Design a protein around this nucleic acid. Structure first.
Ligand SMILES: Cc1cn([C@H]2C[C@H](O)[C@@H](COP(=O)(O)OP(=O)(O)OP(=O)(O)O)O2)c(=O)[nH]c1=O
Ligand SMILES: [K+]
Ligand SMILES: [Mg+2]
Length: 425
DNA sequence: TATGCTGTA
RNA sequence: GGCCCUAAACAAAGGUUUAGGGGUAUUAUACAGCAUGCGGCGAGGUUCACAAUUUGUAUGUACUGAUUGUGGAUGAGAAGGUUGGAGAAAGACCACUUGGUUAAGCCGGAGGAUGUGUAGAAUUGUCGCUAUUCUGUCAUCCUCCGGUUUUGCUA
């Protein structure tokens, strides 16, 4: 066999309750609907990622620390092959329904369009530029993957496959993905005696099946989503189901924008409306009235309305507009500051770890009487400077090249001297 | 006595 | 205790409850970018343990200095700490380890000051082939306005 004929097959690298299968067994298993109906689905493994960001209180001029947690959940190997195979099945029907409704240019995320966020941001900013005096309204959903109603998702899934009810293997996958069960990874590693720091030492599965059935299940580690909403974040099929969920709302929003001479774009839960200025007040309530049929609700705290006028030749905004990592002021395109702050943090951490390792090995050379050596800089320049082939700066100069922006090049210019001064520190 | 791979969501 | 299979009871749901059994090696996702760029040269030794001799002495034995071989580790282009295990040793493996404290750091635009300038320059231990970046809307500093989440010190 050869992997090119089967594009859905990807070999997963993580530990789980099972261990990865070959291509030859996987193809023979997932292509039989009789196996899918009688499949014994394993629970997801779960963990949460910790993040801090700083906020300045405007009433006090004192800094505050805020916290955000994201529930990660990922499935076992054979279940991942089943989800990838049925995502490959559903993708063709969804892309036919895109072309039948002329939604090809409006729906952006999770589609194999051979384009990146730079081209989508360029399309949006060029649309604003071509339209002239207009208003851009940006919207967002609060907890998108955690609030998908199961019956609405079932109705959209039947509409995409073209039936009044799900067939048995499609219904089995629907039951597995909606009323999902999950096991916390750290509690499993505590109970099984697996080290949290080096879990892969001398094992291929997390545990034998009898240890699963006694230690994992009977100690109450399996938690079942008995609520009527949400899908897990990290399955191969979840992004496609999030696109299938929104389809009739995307048709209605395209009709709403096209009636008023406007445009509509959606990238996951990031909706952008570009409309004439007289519609800027009414739109934000009109979208919220229509979206309650899907039972997801708007994140009112993130909503931004920006108005564009000509300053005697130049289109200027009242405040700059952020979309997919770029900042648009009306004629100028800039990089979002969060990526530059992330780059500064990663660069300083990397140079500090390199200096720590340089201090580490020189103490060994001192003991043997060998002469000391200076800091090796090949890995430092490869990851944090323009000389390396794939880093943050290569993305920045690609963005400057595509969007024809000298302002992005002015942002990236002091980073070389900052890397050199961080090395010389 | 101090910790390990771009971009968007 | 979720999931699947078998059997039983109660009615008629894409059902509940009970009893028994099971989980197929050969640290997240989806699109996009890109395939720590590529190829030579460092390398003489050092350390640890055995083995054959001969060397300073005692009585086949006790050690012990040095040659000479066999094997483990190691210099090499930054994966940090603890003298905690294993070990003959290891810069390798196993175990624990992703803290605290800060109030400012970055991006853009206005007011100022301050220093002067079409081929050349910069980039890895080193060399060669590439590849990328900069070059008066010049560079540094101090107050405002808007955005953003990092910055310094210390284990
Ligand atoms: C950022 C991010 C998003 N996603 C998916 C899951 C999210 O439901 C979806 C959109 O996420 P976001 O809109 O980026 O964030 P959010 O919806 O969770 O809201 P908040 O920022 O307040 O937390 O994209 C990931 O799977 N991994 C990621 O790292
Ligand atoms: K080299
Ligand atoms: Mg959201």
């Amino acid at each position: 066999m050869n992997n090119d004929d089967y594009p859905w097959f990807r070999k997963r690298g993580y530990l789980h309750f099972d261990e990865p299968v070959s291509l030859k067994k996987a193809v023979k298993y997932v292509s039989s609907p009789e196996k899918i109906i009688k499949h014994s689905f394993l629970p997801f493994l779960s963990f949460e990622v910790k993040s801090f960001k700083i906020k300045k209180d405007k009433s006090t001029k004192q800094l505050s620390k805020t916290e955000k947690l994201r529930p990660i959940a990922y499935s076992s190997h054979l279940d991942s092959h089943i989800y990838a195979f049925y995502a490959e099945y559903l993708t063709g029907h969804y892309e036919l329904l895109i072309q039948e409704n002329n939604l090809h240019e409006n729906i952006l995320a999770f589609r194999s369009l051979n384009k990146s966020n730079i081209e989508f941001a360029k399309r949006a900013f060029d649309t604003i530029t071509e339209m002239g005096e207009c208003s851009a309204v940006a919207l967002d959903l609060s907890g998108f993957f955690d609030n998908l109603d199961h019956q609405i998702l079932k109705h959209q899934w039947c509409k995409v496959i073209g039936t009044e009810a799900l067939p048995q293997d499609h219904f089995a996958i629907y039951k597995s993905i909606t009323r999902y069960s999950k096991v916390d990874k750290n509690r499993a590693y505590e109970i099984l005696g697996i080290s949290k720091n080096n879990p892969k030492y001398n094992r291929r599965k997390i545990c034998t099946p009898v240890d699963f059935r006694n230690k994992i299940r009977k100690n109450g580690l399996i938690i079942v989503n008995n609520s009527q909403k949400g899908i897990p974040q990290g399955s191969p099929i979840s992004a496609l189901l999030s696109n299938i969920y929104m389809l009739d709302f995307d048709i209605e929003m395209r009709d709403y924008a096209q009636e008023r001479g406007g445009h509509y774009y959606r990238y996951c839960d990031d909706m952008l409306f570009i409309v004439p200025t007289k519609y800027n007040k009414t739109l934000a309530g009109d979208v919220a009235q229509r979206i309650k049929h899907l039972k997801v609700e708007l994140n009112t705290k993130k909503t931004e309305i920006r108005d564009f006028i000509y300053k005697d030749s130049t289109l200027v905004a009242n405040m700059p507009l952020q979309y997919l990592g770029f900042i648009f002021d009306g004629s100028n395109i800039l990089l979002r500051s969060s990526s530059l702050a992330r780059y500064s943090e990663r660069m300083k951490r990397g140079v500090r770890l390199a200096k720590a390792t340089m201090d580490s090995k020189n103490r060994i050379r001192e003991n043997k009487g060998e002469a000391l050596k200076a800091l090796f800089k090949k890995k430092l320049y490869a990851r944090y400077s323009h000389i390396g082939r794939r880093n943050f700066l290569t993305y920045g100069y690609r963005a400057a090249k595509i969007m024809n922006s000298k302002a992005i090049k002015r942002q990236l210019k002091p980073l070389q001297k900052r890397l050199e001064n961080e090395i010389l520190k």
